[PDB]
Structure 1
Amino acid sequence: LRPKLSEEQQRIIAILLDAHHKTYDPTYSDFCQFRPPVRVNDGGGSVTLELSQLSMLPHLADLVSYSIQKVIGFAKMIPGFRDLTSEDQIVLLKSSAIEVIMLRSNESFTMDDMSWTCGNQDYKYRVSDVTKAGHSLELIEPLIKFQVGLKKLNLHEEEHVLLMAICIVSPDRPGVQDAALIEAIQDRLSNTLQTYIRCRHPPPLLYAKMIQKLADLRSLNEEHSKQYRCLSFQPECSMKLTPLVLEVFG
């Protein structure tokens, strides 16, 4: 059976599309306001050199900080999110922040050359740029594989926004108080996504493949946390980050 989308489900999708359009600028016009990207010579991928310079960290920290602000705005518009206690809201935002950033970045990712292209060459991010920010291949390679796999699903924008919303409103995040309420909110979003796929997604499993990407994100979250810890050990590193980044990942 392929039941039609209820009026409420249609409304939820409309609200989420609007939220995304207001919080994700496809022209990347604000990027010139971030601290400039600096790319030192490191063809050898020297960990020692990368840590001593962290040349790309200020720019990426600013990009991520900016993105967390946009994610906060997006989350506030998810139907039901405001009904949660502020304590639960913050817990969900802090624990999903890096995951939603990885998801939303798929919009700028291109399989032409496996990079995140955000306008001019100055804002094109490749694997080598991430290593210049202090991260290792243990995170980057799996990150790229994730991007390609998500790209191949060819999600409708409707599916893309629902997935980011479901990622944020997850009842199994450590620290949540009212798991039952959170689960109710997520179920409403999940049922909307499942109904949309059966009804609006033409042939040629997609729902299952999407749920699996959420599990993949948990692993990337874990690895990023481990690497952020190592990064924080570097003297003078805090100055290369931002107060928001320090709080969310610290």
Structure 2
Amino acid sequence: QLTAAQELMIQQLVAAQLQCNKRSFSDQPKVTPWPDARQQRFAHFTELAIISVQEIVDFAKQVPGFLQLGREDQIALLKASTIEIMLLETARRYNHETECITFLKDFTYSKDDFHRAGLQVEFINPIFEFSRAMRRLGLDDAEYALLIAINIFSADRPNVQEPGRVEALQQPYVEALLSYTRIKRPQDQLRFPRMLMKLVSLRTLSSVHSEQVFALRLQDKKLPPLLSEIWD
């Protein structure tokens, strides 16, 4: 069984995830209309990304352990994990039958909509393949939330000053997920390793994203201030 402390930890992540979701409804009426129209579609997409950044930041603050780290390590961990979490949340919003992604409650986007918004096929196709691979895993809410917490506290991120501390904070989340997947699905021993394998996939996708932001340079496209401070 999960202990009282572990359940408290899990319920906190699940509940914080859901409250950050209710802060999608607040932003939706204030977003650039989807159509010079090409730049408006890029802006539209960058604003979605910024809504997601705000959500991620506000989630991290709620994750027990995060505010125990120094400010620089808080920044260093969020800078790396932001794209990985975005893609994870993107995968969760994917509809297998329509093959669209649904952002901010409604607003559905196809592969071609991603393209119309200025993104390249070298980046788009891995996103949709990762989206498809994630649906197949069929992660529940506690699984999703715990994977994100584990993702956040990765010690090998660039510019981490206290990787020993970061590694120690990840431990209880690794342990809770191990205990959870043992109780939830006793007859699937490989669920937990399979979940961790997706972090490997996410590192590759992050590298693919860096290439994509580099390609914006020559396309006469610029990241807005808040995205630029993380990705430029």
TM-score (ref. length: structure 2): 0.92
The aligned residue for residue 133 of structure 1 is 117
Instruction: Choose which of 17, 21, 25 in structure 1 pairs with 2:18.
Output: 21
Instruction: Choose which of 98, 102, 118 in structure 1 pairs with 2:83.
Output: 98
Instruction: Choose which of 82, 90, 107 in structure 1 pairs with 2:67.
Output: 82
Secondary structure in 2 aligned to 1:116? strand
Query: What residue ranges of structure 1 are gaps of 5+ in the alignment?
Result: 41-52
Maintained 8 Å contact 1:65/1:242: no
Identical-pair percentage: 33
The aligned residue for residue 41 of structure 2 is 56
Return the index of the structure with the highest Cα Rg.
1
Please state how far the C-alpha of 1:227 moved relative to its aligned partner.
1.0
Instruction: Choose which of 203, 209, 231 in structure 2 pairs with 1:224.
Output: 209
Output the CA distance in 2 between the equivalents of 1:225 and 1:78: 27
Please state how far the C-alpha of 1:202 moved relative to its aligned partner.
5.4
Maintained 8 Å contact 1:162/1:193: yes
TM-score (ref. length: structure 1): 0.86
Output the CA distance in 2 between the equivalents of 1:116 and 1:26: 18
The one of the two structures with greater contact order (alpha-carbon pairs below 8 A, sep at least 6) is 1
List, as ranges, runs of 4+ consecutive aligned residues in structure 1 with deviation greater than 6 Å.
none
Please state how far the C-alpha of 1:107 moved relative to its aligned partner.
2.8
Secondary structure in 1 aligned to 2:29? helix
Output the CA distance in 1 between the equivalents of 2:90 and 2:36: 21
Maintained 8 Å contact 1:104/1:164: no
Please give the per-residue CA displacement for 1:145-181, whole angstroms capped at 9, x wherever unaligned.
1111111111111101001111111111011010001
Output the CA distance in 2 between the equivalents of 1:201 and 1:8: 21
Which piece of structure 1 moves more, 134-143 or 67-76?
134-143
Aligned Cα RMSD in Å?
1.9
Maintained 8 Å contact 1:96/1:168: yes
Maintained 8 Å contact 1:37/1:58: no
Output the CA distance in 1 between the equivalents of 2:179 and 2:76: 29
Instruction: Choose which of 174, 188, 193 in structure 2 pairs with 1:208.
Output: 193
